[PDB]
Ligand binder design. Sequence first.
Ligand SMILES: Cc1cc2nc3c(=O)[nH]c(=O)nc-3n(C[C@H](O)[C@H](O)[C@H](O)COP(=O)(O)O)c2cc1C
Ligand SMILES: Cc1cc2nc3c(=O)[nH]c(=O)nc-3n(C[C@H](O)[C@H](O)[C@H](O)COP(=O)(O)O)c2cc1C
Ligand SMILES: O=C(O)c1ccc2cc(CCCCc3c(C(=O)O)[nH]c(=O)[nH]c3=O)ccc2c1
Ligand SMILES: O=C(O)c1ccc2cc(CCCCc3c(C(=O)O)[nH]c(=O)[nH]c3=O)ccc2c1
Ligand SMILES: C[As](C)(=O)[O-]
Ligand SMILES: C[As](C)(=O)[O-]
Ligand SMILES: C[As](C)(=O)[O-]
Ligand SMILES: C[As](C)(=O)[O-]
Lengths: 314, 314
Amino acid sequence: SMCLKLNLLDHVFANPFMNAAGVLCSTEEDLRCMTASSSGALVSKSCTSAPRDGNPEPRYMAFPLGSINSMGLPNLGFDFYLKYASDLHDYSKKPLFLSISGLSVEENVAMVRRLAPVAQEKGVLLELNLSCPNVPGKPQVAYDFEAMRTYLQQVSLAYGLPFGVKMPPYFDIAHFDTAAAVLNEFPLVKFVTCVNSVGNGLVIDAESESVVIKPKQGFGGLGGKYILPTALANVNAFYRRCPDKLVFGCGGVYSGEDAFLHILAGASMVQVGTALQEEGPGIFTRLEDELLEIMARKGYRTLEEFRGRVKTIE
Amino acid sequence: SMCLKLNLLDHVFANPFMNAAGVLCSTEEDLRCMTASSSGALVSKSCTSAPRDGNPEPRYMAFPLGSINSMGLPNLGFDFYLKYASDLHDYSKKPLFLSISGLSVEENVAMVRRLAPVAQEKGVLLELNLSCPNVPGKPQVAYDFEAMRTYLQQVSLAYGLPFGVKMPPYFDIAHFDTAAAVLNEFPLVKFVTCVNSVGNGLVIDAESESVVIKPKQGFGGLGGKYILPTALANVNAFYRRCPDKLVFGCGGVYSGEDAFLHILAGASMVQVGTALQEEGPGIFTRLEDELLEIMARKGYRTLEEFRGRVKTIE
Ligand SMILES: Cc1cc2nc3c(=O)[nH]c(=O)nc-3n(C[C@H](O)[C@H](O)[C@H](O)COP(=O)(O)O)c2cc1C
Ligand SMILES: Cc1cc2nc3c(=O)[nH]c(=O)nc-3n(C[C@H](O)[C@H](O)[C@H](O)COP(=O)(O)O)c2cc1C
Ligand SMILES: O=C(O)c1ccc2cc(CCCCc3c(C(=O)O)[nH]c(=O)[nH]c3=O)ccc2c1
Ligand SMILES: O=C(O)c1ccc2cc(CCCCc3c(C(=O)O)[nH]c(=O)[nH]c3=O)ccc2c1
Ligand SMILES: C[As](C)(=O)[O-]
Ligand SMILES: C[As](C)(=O)[O-]
Ligand SMILES: C[As](C)(=O)[O-]
Ligand SMILES: C[As](C)(=O)[O-]
């Protein structure tokens, strides 16, 4: 109660909230809007070496229970986000994370080598997106554990500084164990963000008998209400398996209560995607007020009092 | 004159609706209740060779958006379900499916060897559950493609008659492609039921700060509203990839509209889990009336006029 400020990764944050990568963070306008908001931090749109237009529209739709997207990695290119980080962002306002999602390991290594001096000079933080396009005959990198171990080996070497990793959801305990073990081989991986969208859902409109996004025959990643228990499970699974890392929660946050659950499950930062897309950046003042109210009601004065303290039965 | 009738797998169904395995189907009382209902078919609780008590309670909980469970395969044992199939079920009322979920390939083989003559004589239909664990610390069988191929080879050889398979959801296009390719190696796999519960979610209660089920530190499979776009994607993905098989839809059905979406995605039968657990078997008359109303509004007279006809954009 009182104030939500916290310290992590050799930075100070006013509160644990931030946007999820890809939401309100693609253009200079969007990054300035996130900076002006009451969020504790912001993350940039995942970038590639070159600018991309992304997929044809419609490519995002939202509904009462959440959203579906197949954006196709539309972004202004790494040079722009790096310039934002190195010249434009006002670090006095809040910390900045830069998300990178190159289409190959080599692309990622090349970007991280460029980011490193800006990281050292300005304190921009790297979130490596371990989600991928479809390559027939090949699953996304975080779903291929030896591939994942390679990327991280090369990035760690190339980058040489503390970073984090944006994960897709897993649905199987053995996968939790294997994925966490991979991540725990890398001491430079200081945070784990759980989760990216639940992959390849399909929303159909009954009146028109049609899928609602154009790309990929309507198939796209799900966010929002649909995915909150999945997200909670991933946050908690990695919190338990990676005691020497931070876990950032992402998925299904619409209220301070939802944020409270993510923090109980183990989240240090709490990222907001769908709900921010649909409500706008005003959501951050609401979420902070709601979280402080729940804390006050419960007698909690700090996040640390309850982070990771979800109770099990017997 | 509109009609919900189907004729598949050598059987006639009054309508496409049935329970999802595990819901209202464990005991003789359950089975007789499902038989008495308006459903077009029923499926028994997934069985093992020996009776099982399942996991400690609480092991199922439901909420406005769906359910979580870790039941632990509680069942009366194979001999009970076989007896029900052989001696007790009134086939004049509707078709019966028997679900099996042995804990090893050998257990499944033993069961289907003994089921075969009753399948031939009485027409009971086998649904093989491929979300069984096999070796603990390995993923569930359907998430291990080699194990899945082995189970299907062995069961095909032992059983020798058309059967179907119950699949977990997949979230990666590469997995849809691999999984369907595996299935398409087995000509006796005549139907594919998509989907089982979305694995290892975690529901947390904010007031008590506690998980809501006891087993597995609160981790369990998700059903209900959470999972409908995941279910639809899997139904459509297998419908497109397995043109010589039927697809049965399961997941997130609460209304005739939800059923209509399943059917547009490619579903033949439509199974009802969570919603049936919550509402009871009266749900089947409501689903039939609701589906018929949508069909009337659109001018459709039979299910075939729209099964699989979901539209894509462009
Ligand atoms: C429109 C849109 C674009 C996104 N783009 C990215 C991205 O560039 N990088 C990434 O890591 N995740 C991206 N995501 C995933 C979100 O960061 C987040 O993991 C997901 O939407 C789940 O959170 P939610 O339930 O709050 O929406 C995107 C999501 C949306 C809805
Ligand atoms: C209480 C409970 C028990 C279940 N037991 C089984 C089972 O024995 N075999 C099986 O194939 N699926 C089982 N399932 C999964 C359901 O058949 C179904 O695939 C899942 O609940 C998703 O459908 P829904 O959204 O309608 O709940 C069970 C589900 C619940 C809720
Ligand atoms: O040609 C296509 O249809 C297509 C479709 C999807 C593609 C996806 C990628 C990787 C997406 C990474 C960024 C991202 C996005 C996104 O930008 O679509 N959405 C999301 O929910 N999570 C993310 O991490 C990269 C290329 C893609 C290409
Ligand atoms: O006692 C054990 O060591 C033990 C052994 C094997 C176990 C196997 C399972 C698999 C559950 C299959 C049935 C099933 C269930 C279930 O009965 O829990 N729930 C669900 O959502 N889908 C299903 O398909 C679940 C729990 C199991 C526990
Ligand atoms: C707020 As926008 C269209 O740049 O994500
Ligand atoms: C157990 As207390 C003082 O947070 O209600
Ligand atoms: C209706 As029951 C407890 O046998 O699933
Ligand atoms: C024409 As067909 C339903 O047998 O693929």
